[PDB]
């Protein structure tokens, strides 16, 4: 049950915010706050391994969506004694060529991010992976905002799996709205 | 044992580079390539833990330098059952408990990225006296960090690596 751990670490904060989607929100989500407490990130890692299931367990490598999903991907890779790789969003118009940092061996991988929003950040990582000789059909996140990410990824042959949805977390915490 | 691991993963590249120090060099070290091979990063982690010694073991948290030193810091934190935090060279992402922490990065050149992280850590109440990296290029990082009261420890210097590889 992430909800409890999230509240404890302030990973779910009450307030008055504006999101990049343009929507006004009474909640700010920050999964990074779970990293500063072994008790908290361990619970998160165990849940990620659980939902990742066999896809993650048999993956030739774990790929993180830099930055956000990088610590999680690195920790999962170490727990599974598997190769790690990651893709970062590069500044545009500078002549930069994308790459899968870490250069894990070609094969089937699972991409990992902390929070799924629109799904575009994950989609970009998938395109880089597929263009560089990797195969990927699963994206794993801790929290899915439930705002179109799954549908967008489904349209490009990728199944999004999450430990929890924002809606479920807010309900459990008796957030109101 | 790090030199052989680097060679096997093609972490040492040749070319015409302009280092962050402003000096030109024909060598670039990409430590990220070790992450794509479990046998390689496990060795690197073992060496980091060895060189980190008690300073790393007694820390209240391991702090990584986004993005380069982030996987290493995250893996060290997990292996040490310690909190993780990181700075994007402001707040310390992760909000680890206040106390004496150790900053970790993959390669130290000018030491600027590490210095920035230390500045942010201290502004937020943390203390730091040690910085840990896999490779120190000897491009001023040790001096810069010493100036701000931080001792830089490295698994190896680029000089040692190049000599071992016969470069």
Q: Do B35 and A78 touch (CB under 8 A)?
A: no
A9 chain-B contacts, CB cut-off 8 A: 95
Q: Do B78 and A79 touch (CB under 8 A)?
A: yes
Q: Do A104 and B78 touch (CB under 8 A)?
A: no
Q: Which CATH class is domain B2-167?
A: alpha beta
Q: How far is CA B59 from CA B68, B74, B129, B132, B155, in A?
A: 21, 14, 10, 12, 18
Q: Do A35 and B70 touch (CB under 8 A)?
A: no
Q: What is the DSSP letter of A69?
A: T
Return the structure tokens found at A126. Answer: 């998938």
The architecture CATH gives domain A2-177: 3-Layer(aba) Sandwich (3.40)
Q: Which candidate, B11, B102, B109, places its Cα nearest to that of B51?
A: B102
Q: How was this structure determined?
A: X-ray
Whether the bond between A21 and the residue before it is cis, its omega within 30 degrees of 0, is no
Alpha helices of chain B — where are they, by DSSP H? 2-8, 38-57, 70-79, 112-123, 141-147, 158-164
Q: For chain B, what are the domain ranges?
A: 2-167
Task: Return the number of CB contacts < 8 Å for A and B.
Answer: 102
A36 chain-B contacts, CB cut-off 8 A: 61, 83-85, 94-97
Q: What is the DSSP letter of A140?
A: E
CA B59 – CA A50 distance, rounded (Å): 30
Min distance B87 CA to chain A CA atoms (Å): 11
Q: Which candidate, A173, A41, A6, places its Cα nearest to that of B77?
A: A41
């Amino acid at each position: 049950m992430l909800a409890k751990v999230l509240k404890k670490r302030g990973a779910v904060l009450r307030g008055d915010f504006v999101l990049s989607s343009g929507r006004r929100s009474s909640v700010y989500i920050d999964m990074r706050r779970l990293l500063g407490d072994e008790s908290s990130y361990s619970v998160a890692l165990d849940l990620l391994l659980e939902v990742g299931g066999q896809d993650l367990a048999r993956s030739s490598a774990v790929i993180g969506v830099a930055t956000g999903g990088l610590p999680w991907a690195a920790m999962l890779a170490l727990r599974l004694s598997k190769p790690l790789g990651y893709v970062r969003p590069e500044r545009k118009g500078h002549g930069t060529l994308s790459q899968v940092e870490g250069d894990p061996p070609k094969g089937r991988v699972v991409v990992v991010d902390d929070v799924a929003t629109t799904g575009t950040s994950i989609a970009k990582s998938i395109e880089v992976l597929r263009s560089n000789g990797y195969t990927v059909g699963t994206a794993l996140v801790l929290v899915d905002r439930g705002e179109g990410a799954g549908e967008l990824l489904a349209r490009m042959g990728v199944r999004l799996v999450s430990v929890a949805t924002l809606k479920t977390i807010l309900e459990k915490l008796g957030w109101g709205g």
